[PDB]
Design an enzyme around this catalytic site. Structure first.
Site, short mmCIF file in Angstrom:
data_model
loop_
_atom_site.label_atom_id
_atom_site.label_comp_id
_atom_site.label_asym_id
_atom_site.label_seq_id
_atom_site.Cartn_x
_atom_site.Cartn_y
_atom_site.Cartn_z
N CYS B 134 47.24 50.58 45.93
CA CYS B 134 46.59 51.74 45.32
C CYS B 134 46.72 52.93 46.26
O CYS B 134 46.12 52.95 47.34
CB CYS B 134 45.11 51.45 45.04
N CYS B 137 43.51 55.04 46.57
CA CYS B 137 42.52 54.33 47.35
C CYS B 137 42.82 54.28 48.85
O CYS B 137 41.91 54.38 49.67
CB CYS B 137 42.44 52.90 46.84
N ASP B 138 44.09 54.08 49.21
CA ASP B 138 44.51 53.87 50.60
C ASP B 138 45.47 54.95 51.13
O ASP B 138 46.32 54.66 51.98
CB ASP B 138 45.15 52.47 50.72
C1 LIG Z 1 44.43 47.24 47.71
C2 LIG Z 1 43.48 47.88 46.75
C3 LIG Z 1 42.56 48.78 47.23
C4 LIG Z 1 41.65 49.40 46.40
N1 LIG Z 1 40.78 50.27 46.95
C5 LIG Z 1 39.87 50.90 46.20
C6 LIG Z 1 38.91 51.89 46.76
O1 LIG Z 1 38.92 52.14 47.98
N2 LIG Z 1 38.04 52.49 45.94
C7 LIG Z 1 38.03 52.23 44.61
O2 LIG Z 1 37.22 52.80 43.85
N3 LIG Z 1 38.87 51.35 44.04
C8 LIG Z 1 39.80 50.67 44.74
N4 LIG Z 1 40.70 49.78 44.10
C9 LIG Z 1 40.57 49.59 42.65
C10 LIG Z 1 39.48 48.55 42.39
O3 LIG Z 1 39.88 47.30 42.97
C11 LIG Z 1 39.19 48.31 40.91
O4 LIG Z 1 39.17 49.55 40.17
C12 LIG Z 1 37.87 47.57 40.73
O5 LIG Z 1 37.84 46.39 41.54
C13 LIG Z 1 37.67 47.17 39.27
O6 LIG Z 1 36.38 46.59 39.11
P1 LIG Z 1 36.12 45.58 37.89
O7 LIG Z 1 34.66 45.20 37.87
O8 LIG Z 1 36.72 46.19 36.65
O9 LIG Z 1 37.06 44.32 38.25
P2 LIG Z 1 36.99 43.48 39.62
O10 LIG Z 1 36.29 44.21 40.72
O11 LIG Z 1 38.39 43.01 39.87
O12 LIG Z 1 36.06 42.23 39.22
C14 LIG Z 1 36.50 41.25 38.29
C15 LIG Z 1 35.48 40.13 38.28
O13 LIG Z 1 35.75 39.22 37.21
C16 LIG Z 1 35.69 37.89 37.72
N5 LIG Z 1 36.50 37.06 36.82
C17 LIG Z 1 37.79 37.25 36.49
N6 LIG Z 1 38.21 36.31 35.62
C18 LIG Z 1 37.18 35.50 35.38
C19 LIG Z 1 36.94 34.29 34.56
N7 LIG Z 1 37.95 33.78 33.80
N8 LIG Z 1 35.69 33.75 34.59
C20 LIG Z 1 34.69 34.27 35.35
N9 LIG Z 1 34.84 35.36 36.12
C21 LIG Z 1 36.04 35.99 36.18
C22 LIG Z 1 36.20 38.02 39.14
O14 LIG Z 1 35.91 36.89 39.96
C23 LIG Z 1 35.48 39.28 39.55
O15 LIG Z 1 34.13 39.03 39.99
C24 LIG Z 1 41.65 49.10 44.92
C25 LIG Z 1 42.59 48.18 44.43
C26 LIG Z 1 43.50 47.56 45.29
C27 LIG Z 1 44.51 46.58 44.74
#
Ligand SMILES: Cc1cc2nc3c(=O)[nH]c(=O)nc-3n(C[C@H](O)[C@H](O)[C@H](O)COP(=O)(O)OP(=O)(O)OC[C@H]3O[C@@H](n4cnc5c(N)ncnc54)[C@H](O)[C@@H]3O)c2cc1C
Ligand SMILES: Cc1cc2nc3c(=O)[nH]c(=O)nc-3n(C[C@H](O)[C@H](O)[C@H](O)COP(=O)(O)OP(=O)(O)OC[C@H]3O[C@@H](n4cnc5c(N)ncnc54)[C@H](O)[C@@H]3O)c2cc1C
Ligand code: NA
Lengths: 312, 309
Positions: B134, B137-138
């Site tokens: 990202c 993000c980084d």
């Molecule tokens: C290297 C990197 C750095 C990043 N840095 C940043 C940053 O600094 N700031 C920022 O805002 N964003 C950052 N992002 C983006 C960020 O990761 C996402 O936007 C954010 O995590 C999305 O949140 P979410 O709740 O949609 O999904 P996630 O945070 O990915 O959470 C998904 C959840 O669903 C659960 N889950 C999945 N499948 C199942 C299943 N079948 N059964 C039960 N549970 C399940 C997982 O275990 C998890 O708890 C970064 C991404 C990457 C790759």
């Protein structure tokens, strides 16, 4: 002398400051107008329990933390009010400050929030904790098995009244207008409800109680000046919120009757003018949360960054 | 048996924020965090764009949000969800290694979307030491350096464009001979003087000094010829994998990519009434933690509203 920014952000709340974070981290010259006569709705609230990563935090402390972050990321924070904008020409113009300085902005984000419309009433202060409520689902224990009053005719109020028919014995809707500022689907549900009694052209004069609970409400007709009393266990305030868009002129940006800026390309933050974006409470009446506003801020800033980049 | 008012599948920013809002609304609520899944915030180190934190570690942020949801009274279940029944109400969630069933009056899907990382020499060595997925993000890894963006889609084009303001030079490395992106993005990227585009090549080796990436080695796929780039960071932009495999295609409306489609903007409503989706499992555009958390709140409020039948 003359300030030119890539991104000009009008509003220093959660939406505006979060926008400032993203815009500044993109290495786009960015300024945020925080206001002086205007403040964030967050400063008025005492205890914030539903902002992610904080079990409990004070609004003022939450706002100080986010402000410091926007400064650190390199956004310029100006404690100045915006009086007007120009959208007819690019760069966009922003008139602000005590001496009406003009800042040039290549893109605008508007995050000016909204205000509560707090009613200076006999008993509004006396029964704000007890009896009077701003949320019907939150204080529905007061309504249960009682007669109840809802103030205002709009979507917020129309949905509060239809919900309180499940619990309250009778629901009184008090409007300050000839008709409703609301959707024809919601008025049909309201006007075909036997448990709803709709009172038009009226305002709330006094709230009467025993010192613990509200027992009656006094209303005075605007044209008449006449006042009558209604027995109720609680008053549900649902008048609506005023988006702080008075600085806008008619035809600059598409808005609804209440003045909320309209979003023209869901799920983006795009307005009716290209290079102009909106975020937070000034374009959202449904949700109204800090984390939600903050989310919009991020989206607006990323929208602006993409839009600016395609112009080069 | 467990019966909840709201069932939340996913324990990231979106999932946990929904749990906070639903719990505080005094609704019986449980959040499926996963065992063999984890939040994408655990893969990153320094978060600098989440409001109220100037600098916080990804895990530390997530711990703070988890404890919050727990404190608001949401039941965090550390268990994977394998399937759901969406044809009948209450909705059924099949989870855990013993295939326990939970019943939920409303559903909130928030399983996120994983950014793809491609394996090569030194990739894992230098993860979060100049290697990332990202750019928004980084961008701290890119500042004042030449960097590589890998991929040929719209995201690679956006990420490379976003990086020219931060880095001195951007290398776009494409496995194919052609972009698979909008005509608009391809024109922009090819007319950008700060980008060099490399076709028919893959990442051979990520190289560093122990603390940080200092060069990336590129190998051509047609002739096998090797080339070495003077890059101080590398960015994976070869796609995201929505974590929606537990759904059977057809149950909910989705993209070809598998993102859950939102059907009533600006709400979190899906194609099935009573089911809402939040975060990156339904957003391929923004992909930020603050945006995701925002949508989680919106989802929990949509559910509460819907439950006042
Ligand atoms: C290297 C990197 C750095 C990043 N840095 C940043 C940053 O600094 N700031 C920022 O805002 N964003 C950052 N992002 C983006 C960020 O990761 C996402 O936007 C954010 O995590 C999305 O949140 P979410 O709740 O949609 O999904 P996630 O945070 O990915 O959470 C998904 C959840 O669903 C659960 N889950 C999945 N499948 C199942 C299943 N079948 N059964 C039960 N549970 C399940 C997982 O275990 C998890 O708890 C970064 C991404 C990457 C790759
Ligand atoms: C009593 C109360 C309690 C609440 N409690 C909570 C809670 O616990 N948790 C929660 O999540 N939400 C709560 N909210 C809702 C939340 O505060 C708002 O939804 C949120 O602050 C909206 O953010 P915003 O950035 O859109 O606007 P605001 O936070 O109101 O910020 C508006 C900004 O715009 C500026 N501005 C306006 N006009 C101008 C101008 N002409 N020139 C320059 N600047 C201008 C203001 O000075 C201010 O900086 C509460 C609201 C109220 C009324
Ligand atoms: Na000034």
């Amino acid at each position: 002398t003359q300030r030119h920014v890539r991104i000009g952000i009008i509003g220093g709340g959660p939406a505006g400051l979060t926008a400032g974070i993203y815009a500044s981290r993109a290495n786009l010259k960015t300024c945020v107008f925080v206001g002086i006569e205007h403040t964030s709705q967050m400063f008025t609230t005492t205890d914030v329990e539903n902002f992610p990563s904080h079990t409990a935090i004070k609004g003022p402390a939450l706002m100080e933390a986010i402000q410091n972050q926007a400064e650190h990321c390199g956004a310029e924070l100006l404690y100045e009010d915006v009086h007007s904008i120009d959208v007819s020409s690019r760069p966009f113009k922003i008139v602000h400050g005590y001496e009406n300085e003009t800042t040039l902005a290549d893109a605008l984000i508007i995050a000016t929030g909204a205000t509560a419309r707090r009613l200076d009433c006999k008993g509004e202060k006396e029964y704000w904790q007890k009896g009077v409520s701003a949320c019907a689902v939150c204080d529905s224990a007061m309504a249960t098995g009682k007669e109840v009053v809802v103030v205002g005719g709009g979507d917020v109020a129309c949905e509060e009244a239809t919900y309180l028919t499940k619990i309250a014995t009778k629901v009184y809707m008090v409007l300050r207008r000839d008709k409703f500022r609301a959707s024809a689907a919601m008025v049909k549900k309201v006007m075909n409800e036997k448990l709803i009694e709709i009172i038009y052209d009226s305002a709330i004069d006094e709230i009467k109680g025993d010192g613990k609970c509200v027992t009656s409400v006094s209303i005075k007709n605007l044209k008449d000046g006449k006042t009558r009393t209604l027995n109720a266990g609680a008053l549900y305030w649902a008048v609506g919120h005023d988006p702080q868009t008075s600085f806008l002129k008619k035809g600059q940006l598409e808005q609804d009757e209440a003045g909320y800026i309209l979003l023209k390309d869901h799920p983006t933050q795009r307005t009716s003018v290209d290079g102009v974006f909106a975020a937070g409470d000034c374009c959202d009446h449904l949700y109204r949360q800090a984390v939600v506003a903050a989310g919009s801020g991020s989206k607006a800033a990323l929208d602006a960054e993409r839009w600016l980049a395609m112009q080069e």
